Design a protein around this ligand. Sequence first.
Ligand code: AMP
Length: 495
Amino acid sequence: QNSLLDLYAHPTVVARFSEMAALHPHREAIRDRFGSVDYRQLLDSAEQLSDYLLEHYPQPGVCLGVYGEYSRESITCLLAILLSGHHYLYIDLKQPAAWNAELCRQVDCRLILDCSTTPTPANGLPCVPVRHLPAAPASVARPCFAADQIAYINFSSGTTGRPKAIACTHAGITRLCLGQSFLAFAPQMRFLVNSPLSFDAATLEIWGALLNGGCCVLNDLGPLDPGVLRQLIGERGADSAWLTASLFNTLVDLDPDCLGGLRQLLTGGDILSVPHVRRALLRHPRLHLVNGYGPTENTTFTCCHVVTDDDLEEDDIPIGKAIAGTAVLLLDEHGQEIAEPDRAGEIVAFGAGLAQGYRNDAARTRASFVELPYRGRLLRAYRTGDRARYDEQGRLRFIGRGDGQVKLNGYRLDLPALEQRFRRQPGILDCALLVRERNGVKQLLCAWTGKADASPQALLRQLPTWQRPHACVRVEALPLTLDRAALLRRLEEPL
Ligand SMILES: Nc1ncnc2c1ncn2[C@@H]1O[C@H](COP(=O)(O)O)[C@@H](O)[C@H]1O
């Protein structure tokens, strides 16, 4: 299938969830520090909240915000939003209010469901306390929709300087989570829920469990590290997890035994480090490790590869082949399909994972999502900007990008755009943005030339936390051979 590529070949999230809740009413849907919530309780709570949402927004298709740390409440919000025909958006209320207001305008986010326990100012944004909502009439009938309905929006900073809203579909989610061989190693499907909702890794962590009758094991313990992971596996029974590459590498460096008890571990988001994958698999030979690759426009994963014994001898771990519901081609400079190994091209994705588009940029949607030949037929397709090559087994081997896009703590970032943006502060002549790694975290560093009193504080105040350089340093001149090593080193220099 060959028609798994069709969005309508996939069920809505709410139909599949309903199937699971009917089949397994008393299985554990959510495990948190307070206890468990089962499928029936989850469905009842979400139906009630949906009654409220529908009372405010009776016609399907509105964007609704969710704020808070992972809790049974936030999970319930996501389901109630989907049940209502609406789509969810993560809003971090600890970001600058002006920034959030503009995100909300971009996607017409009507209301934000505040799940925090402790009061956090809303600063005029349309927030309601989720524990404090008023009763609503039980919905006579919930809206009807197909799998092409928008499930959620994720904002991407990966291109230019304006955040682009990616609208992902019910089908993208159900195609991601159902019938996949790379998810087949943990009958109980107890997923660590760790990745915040601003990342589509969350889509896998949450819906991979709930659409399979599994359990969302929420990390309400603290920042994920070896101890917290060990607790979440040992005390709560998590058997399945996503860990982004740099987090994987750190956990493996520090305490590779902290993975013990995981049945399936998926990692990715950056080029995997073969030495760390080697260390992990040599310690846990029965562990099923998956390299997942894909952009957000294709809903979480595009290709996955189950890591083998032989793979540990290569310079890179394959990113493998198309997940079910997806197809890929590799295209040359001339826009022609590359049918042979060891010839580099651009990855192009087709199928049921394709986002509806950039909710807030029509021109960019028209430019990024285009019809291209697949087999015999013109199909909608997303050009990823990722370069790869096939190996002798017809597996994809990730090469890199030709643009300036980097991955910073889970986010794509157009680095040269942000850099150019620093240049435009008055009194600054030139500026260079660098990246380094401390512990498991990439830090942005900003070097600049210009007047002594010219520090770009007013810009930092306007940026989201995750884009603010860890250090802004004025230098006398920038080293040329630009020199990344010289610059980095000259940054301490007394620091
Ligand atoms: N397994 C992987 N190996 C190498 N690069 C990856 C992998 N997964 C994701 N990426 C990169 O991250 C981009 C998608 O980022 P995101 O949209 O935030 O999920 C891709 O287009 C790649 O550039």
